[PDB]
Design a protein around this nucleic acid. Structure first.
Length: 256
DNA sequence: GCTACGATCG
DNA sequence: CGATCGGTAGC
């Protein structure tokens, strides 16, 4: 079985002190896509680049302790693409792609717009520039899994307080509509929602109040999958036995 | 300190 | 409903 994990680690150095390194192996994952390294290559230990002898490819931001994504895999990729090919966003290290024969897996960290209006605008620009990339990849006809933190909840079921967040970055009408377009217009499959139509499956919880304790969370981490491979998905779960971050790892198993 | 990233309650 | 009520990671 092909096990792919998507985990926003909220600082790889921090997560490695919480037991995330051991989790990489114990999970039995074949491919692990991580987001928010919050570190540059020089700050990464050998074990943070190639954990447990796994191959690894990362894209770090130009600013220190910020963003950054990576893809670890037991198998050696026959091709690697660091960045979207758009400087505006590659400055922030938000996109990595690895090709494994007929398969391709991406680690994505989509920009947040909650800090300020200017960052919301930047986020919308990212949607504009990434949408055509999703359409192209979809047209490749090959098996593709885009894991990562998309920073958008799609429907009411995807967050605890949908009524009160309709004017907040992450659940704005325009954003929800964008996700909807990716799924239906482009034809991508929200793997979790298709596997478990009724299960909320939150993957993130705010630091405010007692959000985590009360399970006041959002589902903003995805594995968007192409049709053929999506139909081969057998199960998935949000790992919460341990906590290495304010995000929880999203695990999906495929009958390849 | 800084940067950067909405649950609670009146 | 609108007003106010931010913990964390790394610099």
């Amino acid at each position: 079985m092909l096990k792919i994990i998507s985990a926003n680690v909220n600082g790889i150095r921090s997560a490695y002190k919480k037991g995330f390194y051991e989790y990489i192996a114990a999970s039995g994952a074949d491919i692990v896509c991580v987001q928010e390294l919050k570190a540059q290559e020089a700050d990464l230990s050998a074990d943070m680049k190639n954990p447990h002898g796994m191959h690894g490819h990362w894209h770090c931001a130009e600013k220190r302790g910020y963003s950054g994504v990576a893809v670890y895999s037991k198998r050696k990729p026959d091709n690697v693409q660091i960045g979207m090919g758009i400087e505006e966003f590659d400055r922030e290290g938000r996109f990595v792609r690895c090709d494994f024969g007929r398969l391709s897996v991406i680690s994505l960290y989509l920009p947040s717009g909650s800090s300020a209006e200017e960052r919301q605008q930047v986020k919308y620009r990212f949607l504009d520039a990434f949408y055509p990339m999703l359409e192209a990849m979809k047209n490749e006809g090959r098996d593709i899994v885009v894991c990562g933190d998309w920073n958008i909840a799609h429907q009411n079921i995807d967050l605890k307080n949908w009524k009160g967040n309709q004017k907040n970055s992450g659940f704005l009408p325009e954003e929800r509509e964008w996700i909807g377009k990716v799924i239906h217009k482009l034809g991508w499959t929200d793997m979790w929602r298709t596997l478990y139509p009724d299960v909320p499956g939150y993957t993130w919880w705010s630091n405010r109040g007692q959000a985590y304790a009360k399970d006041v969370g959002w589902r903003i981490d995805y594995q968007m999958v192409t049709p053929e491979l999506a139909a081969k998905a057998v199960s998935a779960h949000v790992y919460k036995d341990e906590k290495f971050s304010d995000h929880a790892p999203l695990v999906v198993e495929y009958d390849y």
